[PDB]
From Swiss-Prot:
Source species, domain of life: Bacteria
Any Pfam family the entry gives: PTS-HPr
Assembly behavior: Monomer.
Organism: Enterococcus faecalis (strain ATCC 700802 / V583)
Family, per entry: Belongs to the HPr family.
Activity regulation note: Phosphorylation on Ser-46 inhibits the phosphoryl transfer from enzyme I to HPr.
One GO term of the biological process aspect: phosphoenolpyruvate-dependent sugar phosphotransferase system
Active-site residues per Swiss-Prot or TrEMBL entry: 15 (pros-phosphohistidine intermediate)
Known role: General (non sugar-specific) component of the phosphoenolpyruvate-dependent sugar phosphotransferase system (sugar PTS). This major carbohydrate active-transport system catalyzes the phosphorylation of incoming sugar substrates concomitantly with their translocation across the cell membrane. The phosphoryl group from phosphoenolpyruvate (PEP) is transferred to the phosphoryl carrier protein HPr by enzyme I. Phospho-HPr then transfers it to the PTS EIIA domain.
Modified residues (Phosphoserine): 46
Compartments (UniProt record): Cytoplasm
Any one GO cellular component localisation term in the record: cytoplasm
Protein name according to UniProt: Phosphocarrier protein HPr
Length: 89
């Protein structure tokens, strides 16, 4: 059980594109990985929750990873976060 915070550096608006990008990468781990924005942590893939939340404009958020993938899980997210210019390291 380990969480990894971050901040949106895409200043895009975490849309279905970048929005899912993370969720897609976060919601693809055998571990518990979610996103937390403003303090709200929900299965990034949680459109509903995320929807109401969503980030972008240098918006900062926090990711979480718990389980086996935990490492790999967050690994991607983390990397992706800064890989997709969605979030920084």
């Amino acid at each position: 059980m380990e969480k990894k915070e971050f901040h949106i550096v895409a200043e895009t608006g975490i849309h279905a594109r970048p929005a899912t990008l993370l969720v897609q990468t976060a919601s693809k781990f055998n571990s518990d990985i979610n996103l937390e924005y403003k303090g709200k942590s929900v299965n990034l893939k949680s459109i509903m929750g995320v929807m109401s939340l969503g980030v972008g404009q240098g918006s900062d958020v926090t990711i979480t990873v718990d389980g086996a993938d935990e490492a790999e899980g967050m690994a991607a997210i983390v990397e992706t976060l800064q890989k997709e210019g969605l979030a920084e390291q």
